[PDB]
């Protein structure tokens, strides 16, 4: 079960 | 940087691109997000999460 992806908004 | 996918990832946006668990990527740029790398695959270039790959610069 791959990781929770980061929020792609700086 | 020799980028290597640890997991299978399907993009979430137009700026991002997909890779399958084990692709060899080419990191052309990184100068903003400490979460997204702009690498190369499949004749395209896009953002990929740093937690879905094992980095080896």
From Swiss-Prot, chain A:
Domain of life (superkingdom): Eukaryota
Tissue spec: Expressed in most embryonic and adult tissues.
Coiled-coil segments on the chain, per record: none
Function: Promotes the exchange of Ras-bound GDP by GTP. Probably by promoting Ras activation, regulates phosphorylation of MAP kinase MAPK3 in response to EGF. Catalytic component of a trimeric complex that participates in transduction of signals from Ras to Rac by promoting the Rac-specific guanine nucleotide exchange factor (GEF) activity.
Summary of subunit composition and partner proteins: Interacts (via C-terminus) with GRB2 (via SH3 domain). Forms a complex with phosphorylated MUC1 and GRB2 (via its SH3 domains). Interacts with phosphorylated LAT2. Interacts with NCK1 and NCK2. Part of a complex consisting of ABI1, EPS8 and SOS1.
Protein name listed in UniProt: Son of sevenless homolog 1
Organism (species): Mus musculus
UniProtKB/Swiss-Prot annotation, chain B:
Paired cysteines (S-S): none
Protein family per UniProt: Belongs to the GRB2/sem-5/DRK family.
GO CC terms, sorted: cell cortex; cell-cell junction; centrosome; COP9 signalosome; cytoplasm; cytosol; endosome; Golgi apparatus
Alphabetized UniProt keyword annotations: Acetylation, Cytoplasm, Endosome, Golgi apparatus, Isopeptide bond, Nucleus, Phosphoprotein, Repeat, SH2 domain, SH3 domain, Ubl conjugation
GO molecular function, one term: epidermal growth factor receptor binding
Oligomeric form and interacting partners: Associates (via SH2 domain) with activated EGF and PDGF receptors (tyrosine phosphorylated). Interacts with PDGFRA (tyrosine phosphorylated); the interaction may be indirect. Interacts with IRS4 (when Tyr-phosphorylated). Also associates to other cellular Tyr-phosphorylated proteins such as SIT1, IRS1, IRS2, SHC and LNK; probably via the concerted action of both its SH2 and SH3 domains. It also seems to interact with RAS in the signaling pathway leading to DNA synthesis. Interacts with SOS1.
Presence of the UniProt keyword Mitochondrion in the record: no
Post-translational modification: Ubiquitinated by RNF173, leading to proteasomal degradation and inhibition of the RAF/MEK/ERK pathway.
Name of this protein: Growth factor receptor-bound protein 2
Organism, as annotated: Mus musculus
N6-acetyllysine PTM sites in chain numbering: 6, 50
Tissue expression: Expressed in macrophages.
Recorded superkingdom: Eukaryota
Gene ablation phenotype (knockout): In a conditional knockout mouse model, Grb2 deletion induces a rapid decline of myeloid progenitors (CMP), myeloid/erythroid progenitors (MEP) and granulocyte/macrophage progenitors (GMP) and a progressive decline of long-term-HSC and intermediate-term-HSC numbers.
Residue numbers bearing the N-acetylmethionine modification: 1
Domain called SH3: residue spans: 1-57
């Amino acid at each position: 079960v791959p990781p929770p992806v980061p929020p792609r908004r700086r | 940087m020799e980028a290597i996918a640890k997991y299978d990832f399907k993009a979430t946006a137009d700026d991002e691109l997909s890779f399958k668990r084990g692709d060899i990527l080419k990191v052309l740029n990184e100068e903003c997000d400490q979460n997204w790398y702009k690498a190369e695959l499949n004749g395209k270039d896009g953002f990929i999460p740093k937690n879905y790959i094992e980095m080896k610069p």
